[PDB]
Design a protein around this ligand. Sequence first.
Ligand SMILES: [Co+2]
Ligand SMILES: [Co+2]
Ligand SMILES: [Co+2]
Length: 106
Amino acid sequence: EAVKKWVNKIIEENIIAVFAKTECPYCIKAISILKGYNLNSHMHVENIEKNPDMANIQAYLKELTGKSSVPRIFINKDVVGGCDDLVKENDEGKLKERLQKLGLVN
Ligand SMILES: [Co+2]
Ligand SMILES: [Co+2]
Ligand SMILES: [Co+2]
């Protein structure tokens, strides 16, 4: 329960929550895309590789999202998914819609 509670706190206390690992090009790409919307003040990036319970975190992220890979991206507790999902939402206007409803972009 401790691992799940810790992950939950990250998702619930940050509007934009990104789970990442070290030297992860698609993590870096997704984080850069989000910071390009000036979301930094409401983002937390968690490096789950620098963590003794990486496998537990990944298993829980799969239970929540369908995949154990990083990056894993949540926006106001809603599952965006990975960087490819973020790129699809960004290119098709869904990302902007999301952020507008949250007051994060005009
Ligand atoms: Co290397
Ligand atoms: Co900027
Ligand atoms: Co952290």
